[PDB]
Amino acid sequence: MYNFFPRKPKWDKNQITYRIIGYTPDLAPETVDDAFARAFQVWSDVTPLRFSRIYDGEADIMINFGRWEHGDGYPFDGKDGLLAHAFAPGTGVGGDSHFDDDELWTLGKGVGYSLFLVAAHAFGHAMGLEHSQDPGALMAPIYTYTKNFRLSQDDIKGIQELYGASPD
Numbered sequence: 709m710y711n712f713f714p715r716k717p718k719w720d721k722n723q724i725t726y727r728i729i730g731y732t733p734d735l736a737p738e739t740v741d742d743a744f745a746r747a748f749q750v751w752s753d754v755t756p757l758r759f760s761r762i763y764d765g766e767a768d769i770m771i772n773f774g775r776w777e778h779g780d781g782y783p784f785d786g787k788d789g790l791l792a793h794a795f796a797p798g799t800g801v802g803g804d805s806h807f808d809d810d811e812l813w814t815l816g817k818g819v820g821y822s823l824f825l826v827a828a829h830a831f832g833h834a835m836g837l838e839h840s841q842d843p844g845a846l847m848a849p850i851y852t853y854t855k856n857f858r859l860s861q862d863d864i865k866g867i868q869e870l871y872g873a874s875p876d
Protein backbone atom coordinates (compact mmCIF):
# COMPACT_ATOMS: atom_id res chain seq x y z
CA MET A 709 0.00 0.00 0.00
CA TYR A 710 0.90 3.78 0.33
CA ASN A 711 4.09 5.04 2.11
CA PHE A 712 5.39 8.41 3.51
CA PHE A 713 8.86 9.84 4.47
CA PRO A 714 10.44 8.58 7.72
CA ARG A 715 9.01 11.32 10.05
CA LYS A 716 5.69 11.43 8.04
CA PRO A 717 6.22 15.15 7.10
CA LYS A 718 3.22 17.17 5.81
CA TRP A 719 2.20 20.80 5.08
CA ASP A 720 0.77 22.64 8.18
CA LYS A 721 -1.65 24.46 5.69
CA ASN A 722 -4.10 23.63 2.80
CA GLN A 723 -3.25 26.77 0.76
CA ILE A 724 0.05 25.85 -1.03
CA THR A 725 2.05 28.26 -3.27
CA TYR A 726 4.17 27.39 -6.40
CA ARG A 727 6.53 29.36 -8.73
CA ILE A 728 8.08 28.28 -12.09
CA ILE A 729 11.67 29.72 -12.06
CA GLY A 730 12.73 28.03 -15.36
CA TYR A 731 11.25 26.32 -18.45
CA THR A 732 12.33 23.53 -20.85
CA PRO A 733 12.70 24.46 -24.53
CA ASP A 734 11.19 21.00 -25.36
CA LEU A 735 7.61 22.35 -24.74
CA ALA A 736 5.81 25.69 -25.31
CA PRO A 737 5.87 27.80 -22.08
CA GLU A 738 2.03 27.88 -21.99
CA THR A 739 1.99 24.03 -22.39
CA VAL A 740 4.51 23.65 -19.52
CA ASP A 741 2.23 25.85 -17.25
CA ASP A 742 -0.83 23.70 -18.18
CA ALA A 743 1.22 20.52 -17.43
CA PHE A 744 2.34 21.79 -13.97
CA ALA A 745 -1.28 22.99 -13.29
CA ARG A 746 -2.94 19.69 -14.37
CA ALA A 747 -0.39 17.78 -12.22
CA PHE A 748 -1.33 19.90 -9.13
CA GLN A 749 -5.05 19.26 -9.93
CA VAL A 750 -4.78 15.37 -9.78
CA TRP A 751 -3.98 15.87 -6.01
CA SER A 752 -6.31 18.96 -5.50
CA ASP A 753 -9.21 16.79 -6.84
CA VAL A 754 -9.16 14.45 -3.76
CA THR A 755 -7.96 16.73 -0.91
CA PRO A 756 -8.62 20.23 0.46
CA LEU A 757 -5.16 21.12 -1.03
CA ARG A 758 -5.22 24.28 -3.25
CA PHE A 759 -2.18 25.25 -5.39
CA SER A 760 -1.87 28.94 -6.27
CA ARG A 761 0.87 30.20 -8.61
CA ILE A 762 3.07 33.25 -7.79
CA TYR A 763 5.59 34.93 -10.17
CA ASP A 764 8.23 36.32 -7.65
CA GLY A 765 9.93 35.61 -4.26
CA GLU A 766 10.24 32.31 -2.23
CA ALA A 767 7.19 30.01 -2.63
CA ASP A 768 6.39 26.65 -0.92
CA ILE A 769 7.03 24.64 -4.14
CA MET A 770 9.79 26.21 -6.28
CA ILE A 771 9.76 24.49 -9.69
CA ASN A 772 12.80 24.52 -11.99
CA PHE A 773 14.62 22.53 -14.73
CA GLY A 774 18.39 21.98 -14.62
CA ARG A 775 21.06 19.44 -15.49
CA TRP A 776 23.96 17.81 -13.57
CA GLU A 777 24.90 20.03 -10.54
CA HIS A 778 21.97 22.58 -10.38
CA GLY A 779 22.90 24.06 -6.95
CA ASP A 780 21.28 21.69 -4.33
CA GLY A 781 23.98 18.93 -4.06
CA TYR A 782 21.66 16.30 -5.64
CA PRO A 783 23.13 16.30 -9.19
CA PHE A 784 21.16 14.99 -12.25
CA ASP A 785 22.82 12.46 -14.59
CA GLY A 786 22.18 13.38 -18.27
CA LYS A 787 19.71 11.49 -20.56
CA ASP A 788 17.45 8.98 -18.69
CA GLY A 789 18.23 7.69 -15.12
CA LEU A 790 17.04 10.51 -12.83
CA LEU A 791 14.17 12.33 -14.64
CA ALA A 792 13.36 14.64 -11.72
CA HIS A 793 13.14 14.83 -7.90
CA ALA A 794 11.14 16.51 -5.07
CA PHE A 795 11.89 17.21 -1.35
CA ALA A 796 9.40 16.22 1.45
CA PRO A 797 7.23 19.05 2.85
CA GLY A 798 9.28 21.62 4.80
CA THR A 799 10.61 25.22 4.82
CA GLY A 800 13.01 26.21 1.98
CA VAL A 801 14.06 23.23 -0.20
CA GLY A 802 10.97 21.45 1.29
CA GLY A 803 8.58 20.42 -1.54
CA ASP A 804 10.77 22.02 -4.30
CA SER A 805 10.48 19.91 -7.55
CA HIS A 806 13.27 19.90 -10.22
CA PHE A 807 13.16 18.23 -13.70
CA ASP A 808 16.33 17.11 -15.60
CA ASP A 809 16.50 19.13 -18.89
CA ASP A 810 18.78 16.38 -20.39
CA GLU A 811 15.42 14.50 -20.70
CA LEU A 812 13.13 15.00 -23.72
CA TRP A 813 9.91 16.40 -22.17
CA THR A 814 6.75 15.60 -24.20
CA LEU A 815 2.95 15.16 -23.66
CA GLY A 816 0.49 12.69 -25.26
CA LYS A 817 3.27 10.40 -26.66
CA GLY A 818 5.04 7.14 -25.68
CA VAL A 819 8.36 8.83 -26.79
CA GLY A 820 10.35 10.95 -24.21
CA TYR A 821 8.69 11.65 -20.79
CA SER A 822 5.28 13.30 -20.03
CA LEU A 823 5.97 16.47 -17.99
CA PHE A 824 2.41 16.09 -16.54
CA LEU A 825 2.93 12.45 -15.27
CA VAL A 826 6.46 13.01 -13.84
CA ALA A 827 5.20 16.32 -12.24
CA ALA A 828 2.10 14.51 -10.79
CA HIS A 829 4.53 11.78 -9.54
CA ALA A 830 7.11 14.39 -8.23
CA PHE A 831 4.34 16.48 -6.55
CA GLY A 832 3.32 13.29 -4.68
CA HIS A 833 6.82 13.45 -3.05
CA ALA A 834 6.37 17.22 -2.44
CA MET A 835 3.12 16.41 -0.45
CA GLY A 836 5.03 13.77 1.63
CA LEU A 837 4.17 10.57 -0.35
CA GLU A 838 6.99 7.98 -0.87
CA HIS A 839 6.91 5.19 -3.50
CA SER A 840 4.20 2.50 -3.33
CA GLN A 841 4.14 -1.29 -4.06
CA ASP A 842 1.01 -1.15 -6.38
CA PRO A 843 2.42 -1.24 -9.96
CA GLY A 844 -0.60 0.82 -11.22
CA ALA A 845 -0.03 3.66 -8.63
CA LEU A 846 1.30 7.15 -9.64
CA MET A 847 3.82 6.83 -6.76
CA ALA A 848 5.25 3.68 -8.46
CA PRO A 849 9.09 3.92 -8.40
CA ILE A 850 8.91 3.52 -12.25
CA TYR A 851 7.74 5.96 -14.97
CA THR A 852 4.95 4.49 -17.19
CA TYR A 853 3.11 6.35 -20.00
CA THR A 854 -0.70 5.99 -20.37
CA LYS A 855 -2.85 8.16 -22.73
CA ASN A 856 -5.76 8.30 -20.17
CA PHE A 857 -4.63 8.76 -16.55
CA ARG A 858 -6.62 8.28 -13.25
CA LEU A 859 -5.24 8.53 -9.62
CA SER A 860 -5.34 4.92 -8.15
CA GLN A 861 -7.16 4.15 -4.82
CA ASP A 862 -3.64 3.62 -3.34
CA ASP A 863 -2.55 7.26 -4.11
CA ILE A 864 -5.97 8.68 -3.01
CA LYS A 865 -6.04 6.92 0.43
CA GLY A 866 -2.33 7.84 0.97
CA ILE A 867 -2.75 11.60 0.33
CA GLN A 868 -6.16 11.60 2.18
CA GLU A 869 -4.41 9.85 5.14
CA LEU A 870 -2.25 13.05 5.46
CA TYR A 871 -4.69 15.86 4.36
CA GLY A 872 -8.26 14.40 4.33
CA ALA A 873 -10.58 13.92 1.29
CA SER A 874 -12.25 16.51 -1.03
CA PRO A 875 -14.63 18.79 0.98
CA ASP A 876 -16.03 20.39 -2.30
Ligand SMILES: CC(C)C[C@H](NC(=O)[C@@H]1C[C@H](N)CN1C(=O)CC[C@@H](NS(=O)(=O)c1ccc(NC(=O)c2ccc(C(N)=O)cc2)cc1)C(=O)O)C(=O)N(C)[C@@H](CCC(=O)O)C(=O)NCCCCC(N)=O
Nearest residue numbers: 713790791793795796798799802826829845846849850851
Ligand atom coordinates in the same frame (compact mmCIF):
# COMPACT_ATOMS: atom_id res chain seq x y z
C1 LIG B 1 16.38 15.10 -3.98
C2 LIG B 1 15.99 14.01 -3.00
C3 LIG B 1 17.19 13.21 -2.50
C4 LIG B 1 15.22 14.60 -1.82
C5 LIG B 1 14.50 13.51 -1.03
N1 LIG B 1 13.45 12.98 -1.90
C6 LIG B 1 13.48 11.70 -2.29
O1 LIG B 1 14.34 10.88 -1.93
C7 LIG B 1 12.34 11.27 -3.22
C8 LIG B 1 11.44 10.29 -2.47
C9 LIG B 1 11.88 8.95 -2.96
N2 LIG B 1 12.97 8.42 -2.15
C10 LIG B 1 12.37 9.16 -4.37
N3 LIG B 1 12.83 10.53 -4.40
C11 LIG B 1 13.62 11.08 -5.29
O2 LIG B 1 13.94 12.24 -5.18
C12 LIG B 1 14.17 10.28 -6.46
C13 LIG B 1 13.90 10.99 -7.77
C14 LIG B 1 12.89 10.32 -8.67
N4 LIG B 1 13.49 9.06 -9.03
S1 LIG B 1 13.22 8.69 -10.59
O3 LIG B 1 13.67 9.74 -11.48
O4 LIG B 1 13.94 7.43 -10.80
C15 LIG B 1 11.67 8.52 -10.91
C16 LIG B 1 10.98 7.42 -10.47
C17 LIG B 1 9.62 7.33 -10.80
C18 LIG B 1 8.94 8.28 -11.55
N5 LIG B 1 7.65 8.00 -11.81
C19 LIG B 1 6.84 8.64 -12.65
O5 LIG B 1 7.17 9.62 -13.29
C20 LIG B 1 5.50 8.06 -12.83
C21 LIG B 1 4.99 7.08 -11.96
C22 LIG B 1 3.76 6.49 -12.17
C23 LIG B 1 3.04 6.89 -13.28
C24 LIG B 1 1.70 6.29 -13.58
N6 LIG B 1 1.37 5.95 -14.82
O6 LIG B 1 0.91 6.15 -12.68
C25 LIG B 1 3.55 7.86 -14.16
C26 LIG B 1 4.78 8.43 -13.93
C27 LIG B 1 9.63 9.36 -12.03
C28 LIG B 1 10.99 9.47 -11.69
C29 LIG B 1 11.54 10.24 -8.01
O7 LIG B 1 11.11 9.15 -7.53
O8 LIG B 1 10.91 11.33 -7.98
C30 LIG B 1 14.09 14.11 0.30
O9 LIG B 1 12.93 14.49 0.38
N7 LIG B 1 15.07 14.24 1.26
C31 LIG B 1 16.49 13.83 1.22
C32 LIG B 1 14.71 14.80 2.56
C33 LIG B 1 14.57 13.61 3.53
C34 LIG B 1 13.20 13.71 4.17
C35 LIG B 1 13.02 12.63 5.20
O10 LIG B 1 13.75 11.60 5.13
O11 LIG B 1 12.14 12.82 6.08
C36 LIG B 1 15.74 15.77 3.07
O12 LIG B 1 16.67 15.47 3.82
N8 LIG B 1 15.52 16.98 2.63
C37 LIG B 1 16.30 18.13 2.97
C38 LIG B 1 15.33 19.26 3.31
C39 LIG B 1 13.82 18.99 3.03
C40 LIG B 1 13.02 18.92 4.32
C41 LIG B 1 13.26 20.17 5.18
N9 LIG B 1 12.74 21.33 4.74
O13 LIG B 1 13.91 20.10 6.21
Ligand SMILES: O=P([O-])(O)O
Nearest residue numbers: 789790791850851
Ligand atom coordinates in the same frame (compact mmCIF):
# COMPACT_ATOMS: atom_id res chain seq x y z
O1 LIG C 1 14.09 6.30 -14.91
P1 LIG C 1 13.09 5.69 -13.85
O2 LIG C 1 12.40 6.87 -13.16
O3 LIG C 1 12.01 4.75 -14.53
O4 LIG C 1 13.85 4.85 -12.78
Ligand SMILES: [Ca+2]
Nearest residue numbers: 786788790808
Ligand atom coordinates in the same frame (compact mmCIF):
# COMPACT_ATOMS: atom_id res chain seq x y z
CA1 LIG D 1 18.67 12.27 -16.32
Ligand SMILES: [Ca+2]
Nearest residue numbers: 768800801802
Ligand atom coordinates in the same frame (compact mmCIF):
# COMPACT_ATOMS: atom_id res chain seq x y z
CA1 LIG E 1 10.29 25.24 -0.58
Ligand SMILES: [Ca+2]
Nearest residue numbers: 809810811812
Ligand atom coordinates in the same frame (compact mmCIF):
# COMPACT_ATOMS: atom_id res chain seq x y z
CA1 LIG F 1 15.18 18.72 -22.38
Ligand SMILES: [Zn+2]
Nearest residue numbers: 778780782806
Ligand atom coordinates in the same frame (compact mmCIF):
# COMPACT_ATOMS: atom_id res chain seq x y z
ZN1 LIG G 1 17.45 19.58 -7.52
Ligand SMILES: [Zn+2]
Nearest residue numbers: 829839848849
Ligand atom coordinates in the same frame (compact mmCIF):
# COMPACT_ATOMS: atom_id res chain seq x y z
ZN1 LIG H 1 9.32 8.95 -7.18
